[PDB]
Amino acid sequence: SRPPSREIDYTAYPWFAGNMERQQTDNLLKSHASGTYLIRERPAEAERFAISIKFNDEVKHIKVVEKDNWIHITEAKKFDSLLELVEYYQCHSLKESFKQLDTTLKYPYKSRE
Numbered sequence: 413s414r415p416p417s418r419e420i421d422y423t424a425y426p427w428f429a430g431n432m433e434r435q436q437t438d439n440l441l442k443s444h445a446s447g448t449y450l451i452r453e454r455p456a457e458a459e460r461f462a463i464s465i466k467f468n469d470e471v472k473h474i475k476v477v478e479k480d481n482w483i484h485i486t487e488a489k490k491f492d493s494l495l496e497l498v499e500y501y502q503c504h505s506l507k508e509s510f511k512q513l514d515t516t517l518k519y520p521y522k523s524r525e
Contacts (some may be wrong), residue, residue, distance in 0.1 A: 427522075441464065448465065488508050
């Protein structure tokens with residue numbers, strides 16, 4: 413076994429939900445507070461991975477794009493791996509891209525990391 417011929421085990425993380433449904437996402441953060449983040453994994457030709465956070469008593473959805481060994485939800489900050497992308501905006505507010513959304517990754521969708 414070698415590092416290459418694969419990617420990062422994002423599933424190992426507590427905030428990762430592989431094979432998630434749209435209806436499930438809503439019911440997931442339907443009771444949660446304004447500070448619940450979770451990343452889904454749906455088989456799509458355009459958007460590989462997707463994000464769903466809760467804030468202002470609402471469940472928002474972000475789009476993630478990956479190409480040429482790069483990843484970025486928007487054209488504000490580019491990254492090489494999904495980790496660098498989520499790890500960067502987890503400590504700093506994402507208001508830079510979402511003027512309306514100024515919240516960072518606080519609590520997961522399982523309990524409390």
